[PDB]
Structure 1
Amino acid sequence: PRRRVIGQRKILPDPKFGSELLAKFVNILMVDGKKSTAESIVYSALETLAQRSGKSELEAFEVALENVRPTVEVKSRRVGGSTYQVPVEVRPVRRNALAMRWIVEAARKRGDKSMALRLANELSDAAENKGTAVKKREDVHRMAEANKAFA
């Protein structure tokens, strides 16, 4: 915006754990205001991370979030009729926002039966640094140090 610059809006924690990053993850998954159905997918997918591949439930989600986080991104900066792709440092609240969207959008284009199982395998693939959410992260970092000369 030009003039009315904004404070922030508040998110509630999660009920089971008390985390708002986890609650931001349910918001990003939610479609058409169906919040109860998004928690059902998110809760069922996270314990089916736990005893299928490794314990400490919510520690395992943060560590899967550690790998898909970007640090640089590209952004276009216009001069007089020429737009360079300039590599930018991404901010820590934008780091989690891009990482959770890429996880959710990785899980939608899969071949598993349910959404709670597609979520569980993409979070498992992120823990092994594989899949498509990691390669969405790799292409962003490849383009950023490709355009290093336009800094």
Structure 2
Amino acid sequence: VIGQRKILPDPKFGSELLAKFVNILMVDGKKSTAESIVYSALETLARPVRRNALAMRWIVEAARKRGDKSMALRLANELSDAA
């Protein structure tokens, strides 16, 4: 067997527990947009590869056609409701 891919820690905070999250809410290779999505939701709110990955995917996967101003900020509400 082989281990899971090792990703460099999120440069902005130098922490590994945030890069994996921003890579899956990402769409179509648009990482640059991803920070515009989640950092606005994060910087302004103020085996380990099975259950954390699956549960956190469920959070991202319900923001496609909810029909409001912008799901960019709706997911901020969703995580605010979650938190």
TM-score, normalized by length of structure 2? 0.80
Structure 1, unaligned stretches of length 5 or more? 51-90, 128-151
- Going from structure 1 to structure 2, the CA distance change for 1:100 and 1:109 (only over 3 Å counts) comes to farther
Contact 1:108 1:118 in 2 (8 A): no
Is 1:112 matched up with 2:76? no
Q: Residue 40 in 1 paired to residue 36 in 2?
A: yes
1:22 and 1:7 map into 2 onto residues whose CA distance is 19
Q: Which runs of 5+ in 2 are unaligned?
A: none
Partner of 2:52: 96
Distance 2:39 2:32 in 1: 11
Cα deviation code 1:28-77 (max 9, x no counterpart): 11111111111211101113322xxxxxxxxxxxxxxxxxxxxxxxxxxx
Give aligned-pair identity as a percent: 100
Q: What do the CA deviations read for 1:81-134 (whole angstroms, capped 9, x no partner)?
A: xxxxxxxxxx4321210122111113335333223202201101112xxxxxxx
Against the structure 1 CA distance between its residues 124 and 111, is the aligned structure 2 distance closer, same or farther, given a 3 Å change threshold?
Answer: farther
CA distance in 2, matches of 1:18, 1:108: 30
CA distance in 2, matches of 1:112, 1:49: 20
In structure 2, the CA distance between the partners of 1:37 and 1:21, relative to structure 1 (3 Å rule), is same
Relative to structure 1, the CA distance from residue 35 to residue 17 in structure 2 (aligned partners, 3 Å threshold; closer, same or farther) is same
Q: TM-score, normalised by structure 1?
A: 0.48
Q: Is the 8 A contact 1:13 1:20 kept in 2?
A: yes
Report the RMSD for the aligned CA atoms in angstroms.
Answer: 1.8
1:45 and 1:8, CA in 2 relative to 1: closer, same or farther beyond 3 A? same
More helix by share: 1
Query: Which one has the bigger strand percentage?
Result: 1
Aligned residue in 2 for 1:122: 78
8 Å CA contact 1:111, 1:118 repeated in 2: no
Question: Which contiguous aligned blocks of 4+ residues in structure 1 show a shift greater than 4 angstroms?
Answer: none
Select the structure of larger CA radius of gyration. 1
